[PDB]
Amino acid sequence: KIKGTVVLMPKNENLNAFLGRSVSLQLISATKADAHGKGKVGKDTFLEGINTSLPTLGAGESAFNIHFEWDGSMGIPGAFYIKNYMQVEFFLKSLTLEAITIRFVCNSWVYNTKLYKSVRIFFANHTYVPSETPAPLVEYREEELKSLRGNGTGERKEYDRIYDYDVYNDLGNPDKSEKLARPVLGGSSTFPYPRRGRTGRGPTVTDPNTEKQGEVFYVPRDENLGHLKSKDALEIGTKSLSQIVQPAFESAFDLKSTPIEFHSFQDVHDLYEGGIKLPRDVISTIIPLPVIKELYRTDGQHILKFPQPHVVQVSQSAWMTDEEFAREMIAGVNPCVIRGLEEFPPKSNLDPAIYGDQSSKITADSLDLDGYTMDEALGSRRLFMLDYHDIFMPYVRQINQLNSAKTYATRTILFLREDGTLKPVAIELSLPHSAGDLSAAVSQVVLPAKEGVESTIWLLAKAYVIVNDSCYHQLMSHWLNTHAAMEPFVIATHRHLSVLHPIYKLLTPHYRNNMNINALARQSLINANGIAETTFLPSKYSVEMSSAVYKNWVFTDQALPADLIKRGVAIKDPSTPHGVRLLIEDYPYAADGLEIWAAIKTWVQEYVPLYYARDDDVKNDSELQHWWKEAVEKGHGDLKDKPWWPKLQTLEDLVEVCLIIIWIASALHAAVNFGQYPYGGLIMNRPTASRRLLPEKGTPEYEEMINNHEKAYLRTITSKLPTLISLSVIEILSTHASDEVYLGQRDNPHWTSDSKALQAFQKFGNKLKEIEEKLVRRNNDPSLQGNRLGPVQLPYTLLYPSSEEGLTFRGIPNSISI
């Protein structure tokens, strides 16, 4: 008999109930086949007893002894079937067979046997490209992929493990109201979009093209991550905020229990000092809710107190400095949009027949470039911009028609000073113009000012820019480029790469929780009248704006060197270690990012050749070829006609594709995600909406800018009630769960039996530790203070690879996990 140990976790996170005839396992041979060439299968073997011997056992886990009859005619086990005859599902961790050691890493929920169309199968931890699969496992390997793909029909159930694609046709709620109808995103030239995971709930009764509402948005079962500690279930907080907390806040405002608007900046600071007083029944709603109860300190009676945002921990006024406004474009929440400006004035590609004359109104001789002429600044590569003009202009008219929204399409010009810091030198606030226009508001240029009403107008100009930047950050840099862009690759990977496949093992840690958070976001974040639409400027146009931006999304430009070169913030330079020379030498995001990028590249370049010796080996891997074909032609199918997709016929193409996927999922998402509350937890620093244009001279609103500048500012930016909701959301999303798995870590040390792959992975984790030491030295270097810390004195730690749990402003998860 072969001695085995099963480790599992009961659903409650009673052990005698697993004995008797409750759980059967059957070993499957990798070497002895039946007459059809399929590995022979052993007898049903039941769990025999509880193993209390090994002190090495994670929380919630139990170990069971089992002995398998396995004679000569059976060969070597390479897989097993398991049947759960119990009513309730359990979480299967592993099987370990001794003195034959063979390890099986399972980490999968096993529901009652009657719920499955075919018996659950698990493979030992060996790694095989398809031409290396032992012959008696070839059919089992392919049948398991066929099972995962399903047939493209049916309402998906909680226990299903079926991966497939669908369009974003589940955000509208047209059965509730015509006002809640939304365009389908994906599957048309008007609205191209990445695909998402298919749920199959079926059509609404009013629109056959929109998917009906559902209490639970399915994800394949093992994508729905359980947590030992309920506080770690951060993705569910989004749902609780929308469904329970937001209505409670709304009630406090409807009943006039708290002022409707902030009246001074101190009313905003109060949120993390003394707190806000709210009705008792409002506090009583929050206090018992998992995740939500961690967001606020409370007296249990009437007070909620938000945590002090990092950006104010040293100076509560530094966010208002021009130095910090520009520094955040290279070391802030959204450090990836600034571009070099190589001509002046800046140009627009938009049609003047639609929007009016698009010539810039910024004059060169009005700009203070520290004594440089414009030609000198351009030539020395010292001029940059944050350009939202062409991005926002197409939507300004329809946004400004909404009752409580008004924006400009902004452009900010920045100068790289000789001291190496950026300074803002002008903001252009543009509006579309057409013959029939009812509005008399005009475009204007605003220049820096420190005194008088001109200083208030300049501070407001910065707020209009940061509203554009916050909307672009959240919808494009963050949602579109990480969450949404990655999901098609998750789906393709499970559909086409076996668990046995080396590239499955390389990529899947980088998908942890991504389908789950995305489904929860379709339900409560980006749904019609959901949190994003009611907190961000574009309202009901928000998600469709991300579709318009996706028209220009380029997979190969997500690589960090290509991004930097495309934006004109670095140049190709083969004499440099990273192959690019930064044009802003101390650009903290890019400088730290290049280190992480290089480490991932080395890991991928070391792992790939362990499994692929020539370009032909890549061409000849049928799972890999099917995977990439489907990811492109189905998952990102609206961009299938584009010439820039890698072909995947060479080793270098495989490395490139894997490298870009891991970068997007880990460091890029971390850099755009974990600064959300640290920088945006002060709404004045990261306003999410603007509600009025600049006032005309001779009006009470203009006199208010002179006499009460803080009120003028607060009336312009996000109102108090959506601010309380936005702050709560971003606090959740900026938190690391205690069970996170970070870059350089895996959830199990035995993910492969291949020692060379294990060694290469250890080298990768060591290199990340080395890199963190280097980044600490950078933050401690007084010469780099201006960009790495700024007047907010906030060291740039967002690309430190490691972190403890909580709202830490550091740490790079493997995946898009929140």
Distance from chain centroid for Cα 34:
47
Q: Are 593 and 667 in contact (CB under 8 A)?
A: yes
Q: How many CB atoms lie within 10 A of CB 605?
A: 15
Active site residue 478: yes
Alpha carbons 605 and 765: distance in angstroms, whole number: 15
φ/ψ of 93, rounded to 5, equals: -90, -55
Alpha carbons 311 and 323: distance in angstroms, whole number: 13
CB of 586 to Fe ion, least distance (A): 27
Which is nearer to Fe ion, 686 or 720 (by Cβ)?
A: 686
If DSSP codes are grouped into helix, strand and coil, which group holds residue 307?
coil
Active site residue 818: yes
> Which among 102, 664, 683, 818 is annotated as catalytic?
818
Alpha carbons 277 and 112: distance in angstroms, whole number: 49
CB of 489 to Fe ion, least distance (A): 16
> Considering only 377-385, 409-417, 501-509, 667-675, which stretch makes contact with Fe ion by CB under 5 A?
667-675
Alpha carbons 789 and 290: distance in angstroms, whole number: 34
Which is nearer to Fe ion, 498 or 513 (by Cβ)?
A: 513
Question: Residue 321: which residues within 8 A CB-CB, separation 6 or more?
Answer: 791
> Is 349 labeled as ligand-binding?
no
The 8-class DSSP code of residue 480 comes to I
The 8-class DSSP code of residue 123 comes to E
Binding residues for Fe ion, total number by CB under 5 A: 1
Active site residue 669: yes
Q: Are 174 and 207 in contact (CB under 8 A)?
A: yes
Which is nearer to Fe ion, 673 or 716 (by Cβ)?
A: 673
CB of 176 to Fe ion, least distance (A): 28
Which is nearer to Fe ion, 421 or 482 (by Cβ)?
A: 482
Residue nearest to Fe ion (CB): 673
φ/ψ of 692, rounded to 5, equals: -155, 155
CB of 237 to Fe ion, least distance (A): 13
Burial 97-130 (b: 16+ CB within 10 A, else e): beeeebbbbbeebbbeeeebeeebbbbbbbbbbb
Q: How many CB atoms lie within 10 A of CB 580?
A: 20
CB of 678 to Fe ion, least distance (A): 14
Q: Which of 739, 729, 721 is nearest to 803 (CA)?
A: 739
CB of 268 to Fe ion, least distance (A): 25
Which is nearer to Fe ion, 466 or 521 (by Cβ)?
A: 521
Which is nearer to Fe ion, 125 or 673 (by Cβ)?
A: 673
> Considering only 276-284, 296-304, 354-362, 671-679, which stretch makes contact with Fe ion by CB under 5 A?
671-679
> Considering only 335-343, 378-386, 427-435, 668-676, which stretch makes contact with Fe ion by CB under 5 A?
668-676
If DSSP codes are grouped into helix, strand and coil, which group holds residue 784?
helix
Which is nearer to Fe ion, 673 or 723 (by Cβ)?
A: 673
CB of 480 to Fe ion, least distance (A): 11
What residues numbered 133-172 form the site for Fe ion, per CB under 5 A?
none
39 forms beta bridges with 33
Alpha carbons 466 and 471: distance in angstroms, whole number: 8
Q: Which of 398, 513, 516, 429 is nearest to 695 (CA)?
A: 429
Contact pattern from residue 615 through residue 654 relative to Fe ion, giving x for each residue in contact according to CB under 5 A and a dash for the rest: ----------------------------------------
Active site residue 126: no
> Is 669 labeled as ligand-binding?
yes
> Which among 310, 496, 669, 736 is annotated as catalytic?
669
Which is nearer to Fe ion, 23 or 732 (by Cβ)?
A: 732
CB of 245 to Fe ion, least distance (A): 20
Contact pattern from residue 517 through residue 546 relative to Fe ion, giving x for each residue in contact according to CB under 5 A and a dash for the rest: ------------------------------
Q: Find tokens 């060591």 and name the residue.
A: 766
Q: Are 27 and 77 in contact (CB under 8 A)?
A: yes
> Considering only 278-286, 356-364, 372-380, 665-673, which stretch makes contact with Fe ion by CB under 5 A?
665-673
If DSSP codes are grouped into helix, strand and coil, which group holds residue 741?
coil
Which is nearer to Fe ion, 26 or 474 (by Cβ)?
A: 474
Distance from chain centroid for Cα 739:
17
CB of 519 to Fe ion, least distance (A): 14
Alpha carbons 735 and 738: distance in angstroms, whole number: 9
Question: Residue 800: which residues within 8 A CB-CB, separation 6 or more?
Answer: 772, 775, 776, 810, 811, 812
> Which among 169, 334, 468, 673 is annotated as catalytic?
673
Which is nearer to Fe ion, 603 or 674 (by Cβ)?
A: 674
Whether the upstream peptide bond of residue 502 has omega within 30° of 0, thus cis, is no
CB of 672 to Fe ion, least distance (A): 7
> Considering only 145-153, 206-214, 542-550, 670-678, which stretch makes contact with Fe ion by CB under 5 A?
670-678
> Is 503 labeled as ligand-binding?
no
If DSSP codes are grouped into helix, strand and coil, which group holds residue 95?
strand
In 188-326, DSSP assigns E strands to: 196-197, 276-277, 297-298, 303-305
Question: Residue 344: which residues within 8 A CB-CB, separation 6 or more?
Answer: 364, 374, 378, 383
> Is 478 labeled as ligand-binding?
yes
Alpha carbons 519 and 197: distance in angstroms, whole number: 8
Active site residue 483: yes
Burial class (CB in 10 A: 0-12, 13-18, 19+), 142: middle
Alpha carbons 814 and 797: distance in angstroms, whole number: 17
> Which among 389, 483, 496, 636 is annotated as catalytic?
483
What residues numbered 672-701 form the site for Fe ion, per CB under 5 A?
673
Q: How many CB atoms lie within 10 A of CB 88?
A: 12
If DSSP codes are grouped into helix, strand and coil, which group holds residue 651?
helix
Q: Find tokens 């010796």 and name the residue.
A: 613
Q: Are 716 and 463 in contact (CB under 8 A)?
A: yes
> Which among 389, 478, 636, 736 is annotated as catalytic?
478
> Is 126 labeled as ligand-binding?
no
φ/ψ of 50, rounded to 5, equals: -85, 130
CB of 721 to Fe ion, least distance (A): 24
In 146-270, DSSP assigns E strands to: 165-166, 196-197
User: Amino acid identity, residue 804?
Assistant: E
Which is nearer to Fe ion, 172 or 335 (by Cβ)?
A: 335
Site residues, Fe ion (CB under 5 A) = 673
Binding residues for Fe cation: 478, 483, 669, 673, 818
So which residues are the catalytic ones? Answer: 478, 483, 669, 673, 818
Binding annotation:
478, 483, 669, 673, 818
